[PDB]
Design a binder for this molecule. Sequence first.
Ligand SMILES: C[S@@+](CC[C@H](N)C(=O)[O-])C[C@H]1O[C@@H](n2cnc3c(N)ncnc32)[C@H](O)[C@@H]1O
Ligand code: NA
Length: 273
Amino acid sequence: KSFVDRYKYTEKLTGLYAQTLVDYSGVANTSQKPLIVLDNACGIGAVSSVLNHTLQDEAKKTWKLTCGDLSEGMLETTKRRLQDEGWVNAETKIVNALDTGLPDGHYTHVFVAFGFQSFPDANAALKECFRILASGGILASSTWQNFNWIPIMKAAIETIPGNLPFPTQKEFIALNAGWDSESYIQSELEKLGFRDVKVIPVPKETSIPIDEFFEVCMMIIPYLLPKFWTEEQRESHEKDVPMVLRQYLQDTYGANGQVPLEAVALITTGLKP
Ligand SMILES: C[S@@+](CC[C@H](N)C(=O)[O-])C[C@H]1O[C@@H](n2cnc3c(N)ncnc32)[C@H](O)[C@@H]1O
Ligand code: NA
């Protein structure tokens, strides 16, 4: 369980990628046909809010926005936002991304902003996206790749004698093989028939307090070091890693007790032929 697998550190960040996801989808580009859009797992409607502010009035006269989610509590909040912000031709309703009950070939755009990693069956949800998309429809999703926490841990390991092996941020990711992977997403989309698939990484800056950053690292090294250090290296150093890291973190970030850190989301786009 990494930092991006913890709701504590990602809940506050998902809103930062809503505008990004809308821009990459291309939805704001003028098109001939009317827009029929599904904000799948819309939550508090982060994407829907952006859509309504980004789209000009002419495209909104003829479009239909559906905000789907399985939580009534979040739909209650989203319908009040729909009202306050003056969304046009927008609706809220219960929609199971696993089993949407929505028509075949009906939507020009399906948005899934940080949903696939929450679904108990992401493959079922992806096939539903494909089914309900019309010809020429666009699937646009955002998912978590990682926090760039390896270089900080690495800087601490570097201070121990023995020039000890340790993965780069990339190598640790390949230990991990799902929607946090560009190659995996491209393959899963292309299998179902999506074309022109693009998976782009997008970084945003966040920070984690020293105390919590340390605790998470300590939950991970029991798995990570045995894979990279030999028995002899572990016997000499492994027990010292905790105090080394805590010392590094205090020396480096003790002034304000916060670890600056980059969060990377993957923006995915694909076209139903
Ligand atoms: C991390 S939030 C993302 C919310 C919003 N899309 C955003 O950009 O922040 C995940 C959302 O997916 C919803 N969800 C989880 N399982 C679902 C399912 N099977 N069908 C529809 N929504 C689901 C949850 O209710 C939650 O609001
Ligand atoms: Na992470």
